[PDB]
Amino acid sequence: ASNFTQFVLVDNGGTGDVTVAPSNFANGVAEWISSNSRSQAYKVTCSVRQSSAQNRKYTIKVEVPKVATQTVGGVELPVAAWRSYLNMELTIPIFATNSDCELIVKAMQGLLKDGNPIPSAIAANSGIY
Amino acid sequence: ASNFTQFVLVDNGGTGDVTVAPSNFANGVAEWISSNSRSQAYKVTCSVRQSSAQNRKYTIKVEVPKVATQTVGGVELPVAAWRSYLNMELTIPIFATNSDCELIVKAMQGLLKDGNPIPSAIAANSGIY
Amino acid sequence: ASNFTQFVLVDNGGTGDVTVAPSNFANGVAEWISSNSRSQAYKVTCSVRQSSAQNRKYTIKVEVPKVATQTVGGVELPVAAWRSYLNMELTIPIFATNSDCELIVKAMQGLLKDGNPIPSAIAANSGIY
Amino acid sequence: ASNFTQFVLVDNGGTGDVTVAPSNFANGVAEWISSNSRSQAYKVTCSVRQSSAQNRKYTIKVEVPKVATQTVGGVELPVAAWRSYLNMELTIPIFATNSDCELIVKAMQGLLKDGNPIPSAIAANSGIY
Amino acid sequence: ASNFTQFVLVDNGGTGDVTVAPSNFANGVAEWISSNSRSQAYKVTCSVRQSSAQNRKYTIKVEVPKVATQTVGGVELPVAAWRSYLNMELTIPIFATNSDCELIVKAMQGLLKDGNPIPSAIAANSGIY
Amino acid sequence: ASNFTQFVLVDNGGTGDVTVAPSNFANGVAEWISSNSRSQAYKVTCSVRQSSAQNRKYTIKVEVPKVATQTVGGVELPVAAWRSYLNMELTIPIFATNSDCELIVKAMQGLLKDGNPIPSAIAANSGIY
RNA sequence: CAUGAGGAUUACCCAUG
RNA sequence: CAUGAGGAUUACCCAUG
RNA sequence: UGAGGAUUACCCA
RNA sequence: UGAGGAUUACCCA
């Protein structure tokens, strides 16, 4: 059994899909990277820790790159014009059961479901109105 | 037009669904709360700001309560045994187009899709392995 | 293959069986827990290290909880009345072959087999005499 | 109800079985050894004590000889190259009943049952993967 | 796309082939060993990390046992007289694409191809002349 | 004989093959380079030393360049965008016979053979999982 | 000299012993 | 690192070498 | 802790 | 900035 596996980060039907694969798991921090130039790759990291006596805390990070070609002195390198950074921390008391956790996950999926306020604002370069 | 509307945070088919409704939008911070006792309610907040010259930054927060009844001196009040806290920050350069933003959103939805590493770890009170 | 799989820790003839599953591998420590709130779960951890130039040491830990419901601040929480702890360290010389290691495993199984001295004493809350 | 008797430590089904018998009882520490020289013997020791006000603690030690290429009755140096050491400590809260203790024994048996992760890894000179 | 599987390390054409299989995955470092005692085994380990801002680095280690006059399963001292150690470090700039990386692998294969200088010198206990 | 000969480092079926030739042996370091300007050449170096009283250590280095044309001071020069570095050290005990050494060579060849774990990961810009 | 899943401008440098 | 029939709130702490 | 900033497992109050 | 903690739009380095 293992969940430190490869998975689809961005789904575009079946083609153009962005897949991220395991790359490193040093110091309790799991890392996934997409293939090809590390410089233009998507990155995902995850870790859990006992934040306090009663809490466990997940720290998740995602990096979405803007693929571009850099030319300098006639030398061109595959780079990322810029990157979008996602940073999330999830705190869960040790009294939470698997049921409570599944609920927390549905809340996160619901928060980002298509058509809902927040994902809509973000996708349109907007805020709330 | 308005996206500061009511929406389903937790989806349980059609029954038991947790709906969050607008409640306040003071100081550029939008807030949604579920119905009934504010003490046992789900909470969602969102805001955007120009974090720097080139970046805009979204700050989103979600609160999942563990509904319980508190009895003290024979007096019982509707409370939350504890709460799970979600805290996410999304940074997006001003060069991002609506297309770039839609991609960023799919990355977030993919990260949390059922069966993928992270949501699976969380739902099972686990880490990566 | 991959030996990091779930298994039955406490066998009660398929009914009320305490089964434990892979939950974390951060920092080279393999962890297994039962489907419970992290506060009431059975926990098993394992790690191997090359303790010396010519030795390998396995460190195994098992946590057996006495589940209970506690009323804190006039509120009920799933918790553990107390926990029992098993800490075992096994040092094997690098010269031991697979058959030598199989011999060690059999010794540990025979040691704890029903009816034998030690498990008998433990279960009866007594010493050896 | 004297339980300080000999038993089969390594079971090979009648043939090639290793029996271990009472050999010492100095200081309440019970000892069993196989019929070998003490340098090549199978040794088992066990004792119980009130570790603290809240706990009792069983200390179980096992010594297993490396058998491959072993010269029966010979002088094999260095000692650390020919022996494996098992060190078990079981902490049990004073509130544990015989029933509670029986379950703790089952947990130990389950941990080491044939085909499960830990014993499988040990028998294959492996770790968890 | 899990690539952590067993493979043939030493190929003698079906007969006398040395297979190496997954034996550990602690700390992201993958390990494979042959079916021997760890003192006489063939060991292979591999890990990747972002050595710096500009580079990624693969660390590959191999341990090969001295076989001539070897006593299978025996205790052979000193350890340094019976084992060879291979230590490989591969530094790859983040701009390298999969194509670039495929070429780097071909270079490594060419370096060690049968009949070429380096492998010929090593196999003959020689240097370059 | 004399093993200091040229050889094919990168094989592309006799067309676009990177062949490397003897270029220097100063200071006991055998060097090979490809037909290029010293700034864009593939480089291979090898040296053997009696690292200890009872050991011999081979130190091998390979440099794979990413050729490019750079405009410096408004002038075009053949150069390397970046370089990939392979550094390997092999320690062999003086007791290893020629057949023992042949075994080491085969292990290194099997390690990098197409389809096996490591070369697969490297070529796909990923780790082992 | 030794050890480092230490670094690089790559036959050099760093830390520890 | 090692040793403890050393302790625990249990991947931590203590003593000795 | 922070609708604190990032060259993003770093850094400031 | 922080795999920094929360009574969670607060607070610490």
Side-chain angles (χ1 to χ4, degrees), chain D residues 109-129:
Chain D
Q109 302 179 318
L111 177 74
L112 302 166
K113 186 185 179 181
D114 227 50
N116 285 338
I118 309 296
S120 297
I122 293 171
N125 265 301
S126 295
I128 304 303
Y129 65 81

Side-chain angles (χ1 to χ4, degrees), chain E residues 63-98:
Chain E
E63 276 179 35
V64 182
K66 167 186 162 52
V67 178
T69 75
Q70 160 200 71
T71 299
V72 186
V75 177
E76 309 173 311
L77 285 326
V79 169
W82 294 90
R83 306 187 72 63
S84 294
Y85 304 85
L86 173 53
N87 215 289
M88 277 175 55
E89 287 217 305
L90 187 52
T91 296
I92 309 177
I94 61 178
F95 311 97
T97 70
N98 289 345

Side-chain angles (χ1 to χ4, degrees), chain C residues 19-91:
Chain C
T19 154
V20 115
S23 61
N24 200 349
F25 203 174
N27 297 301
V29 180
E31 184 194 62
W32 285 261
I33 62 172
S34 53
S35 293
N36 284 287
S37 66
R38 212 80 192 183
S39 74
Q40 300 192 317
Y42 278 77
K43 190 177 177 180
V44 181
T45 59
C46 179
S47 74
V48 201
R49 147 177 59 97
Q50 190 113 350
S51 71
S52 144
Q54 299 175 20
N55 276 152
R56 277 176 64 261
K57 186 178 175 191
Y58 286 80
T59 293
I60 302 158
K61 300 180 183 180
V62 182
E63 274 178 31
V64 183
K66 181 57 168 184
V67 304
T69 308
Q70 181 170 77
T71 304
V72 186
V75 180
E76 276 174 38
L77 301 173
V79 72
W82 44 264
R83 277 171 179 278
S84 182
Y85 302 83
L86 172 60
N87 280 290
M88 59 171 64
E89 311 196 316
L90 175 60
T91 303

Side-chain angles (χ1 to χ4, degrees), chain A residues 1-12 18 25 30 32 42 44-48 55-56 58 60 62 64-66 82-93 95-114 116-129, chain B residues 1-12 18 25 30 32 42 44-48 55-56 58 60 62 64-66 82-93 95-114 116-129:
Chain A
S2 186
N3 70 350
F4 185 39
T5 64
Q6 170 177 53
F7 73 90
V8 181
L9 182 65
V10 180
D11 180 359
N12 300 300
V18 181
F25 195 171
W32 288 262
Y42 284 67
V44 182
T45 62
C46 182
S47 68
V48 224
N55 297 312
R56 278 208 317 149
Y58 290 82
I60 304 164
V62 179
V64 187
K66 178 55 181 185
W82 42 265
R83 277 173 184 267
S84 184
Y85 298 82
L86 175 54
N87 257 291
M88 51 188 259
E89 299 206 301
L90 180 55
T91 292
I92 307 175
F95 310 106
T97 63
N98 277 38
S99 299
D100 296 324
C101 292
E102 277 163 32
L103 193 69
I104 294 170
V105 169
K106 299 198 193 307
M108 291 184 270
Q109 301 174 318
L111 173 76
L112 299 171
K113 181 184 181 180
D114 268 316
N116 283 350
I118 296 183
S120 302
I122 296 173
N125 254 304
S126 309
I128 307 302
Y129 63 81
Chain B
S2 186
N3 70 350
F4 185 39
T5 64
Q6 170 177 53
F7 73 90
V8 181
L9 182 65
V10 180
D11 180 359
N12 300 300
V18 181
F25 195 171
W32 288 262
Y42 284 67
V44 182
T45 62
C46 182
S47 68
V48 224
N55 297 312
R56 278 208 317 149
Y58 290 82
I60 304 164
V62 179
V64 187
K66 178 55 181 185
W82 42 265
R83 277 173 184 267
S84 184
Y85 298 82
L86 175 54
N87 257 291
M88 51 188 259
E89 299 206 301
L90 180 55
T91 292
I92 307 175
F95 310 106
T97 63
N98 277 38
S99 299
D100 296 324
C101 292
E102 277 163 32
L103 193 69
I104 294 170
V105 169
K106 299 198 193 307
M108 291 184 270
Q109 301 174 318
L111 173 76
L112 299 171
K113 181 184 181 180
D114 268 316
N116 283 350
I118 296 183
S120 302
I122 296 173
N125 254 304
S126 309
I128 307 302
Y129 63 81

